[PDB]
Ligand binder design. Structure first.
Ligand SMILES: O=C(O)[C@H]1CCCN1C(=O)C(CS)CS
Ligand SMILES: [Zn+2]
Ligand SMILES: [Zn+2]
Length: 229
């Protein structure tokens, strides 16, 4: 279930995988949830996405210390928006190595974010260049093309049924495709489909602004994105 830890929520998704959830008032929209992931890889922990704020992100690290009690080797953030990179300083204060798409690091200052320390680059087929993602263990990082943003990246967790679409994917029951302020409306549908094709066996799709869902999240998101063109 949903473990409440201060103002955050944690949910175990698999033996070594948890979802972190944090909330921010978006004046005119209410308190918006954002999800990321925590993965135990043997004797270390890997984080996908910060919380919205430094204070919330320090609480993620607090929860990890209580519930896992192993060092956080690295974090990867999935685009330069506040829900994914707003807590970078908390990671850096904690001594955690940080990674983002090169383009996310380029965009970070203008988006009001602190850049990650390290930049990922991607091959033509979308897979991360392995030299740029050293020691990523089971995290398989894929750039699906521009969609939710120009820099959005996605992450599969090897050894599990899980793939993380970040803010690119909404759930199968979503009424509409939101969070589109920086979206690439022409390429969105293809990028959503490319995410699905990159992780063809993943049966649990995790995303920033919906609870985990089946692969119908991907098909439904892509279908709605077809209407943006
Ligand atoms: O408000 C929007 O449309 C876009 C563009 C600016 C940030 N954004 C978001 O939705 C937030 C979550 S509220 C980050 S994914
Ligand atoms: Zn975003
Ligand atoms: Zn988001």
């Amino acid at each position: 279930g949903d473990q409440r830890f201060g103002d955050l929520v944690f949910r175990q998704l698999a033996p070594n995988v948890w979802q972190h959830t944090s909330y921010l008032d978006m004046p005119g929209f209410g308190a918006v949830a954002s999800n990321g992931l925590i993965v135990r890889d043997g004797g270390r922990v890997l984080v996908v996405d910060t919380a919205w704020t430094d204070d919330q992100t320090a609480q993620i690290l607090n929860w990890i210390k209580q519930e896992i009690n192993l060092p956080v080797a690295l974090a990867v953030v999935t685009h330069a928006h506040q829900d994914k990179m707003g807590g970078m300083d908390a990671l850096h204060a904690a001594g955690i190595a940080t990674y983002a798409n090169a383009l996310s690091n380029q965009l970070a200052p203008q988006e009001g974010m602190v850049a990650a320390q390290h930049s990922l680059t991607f091959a033509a087929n979308g897979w991360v260049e392995p030299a740029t993602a050293p020691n990523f263990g089971p995290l398989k990082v894929f750039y699906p093309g521009p969609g939710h943003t120009s820099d959005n990246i996605t992450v599969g967790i090897d050894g599990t049924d899980i793939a993380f679409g970040g803010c690119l994917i909404k759930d199968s029951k979503a009424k509409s495709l939101g969070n589109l302020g920086d979206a690439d409306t022409e390429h969105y549908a293809a990028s959503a489909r490319a995410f699905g094709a990159a992780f063809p066996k993943a049966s649990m799709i995790v995303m920033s602004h919906s609870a985990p869902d089946s692969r119908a999240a991907i098909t439904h998101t892509a279908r709605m994105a077809d209407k943006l063109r």
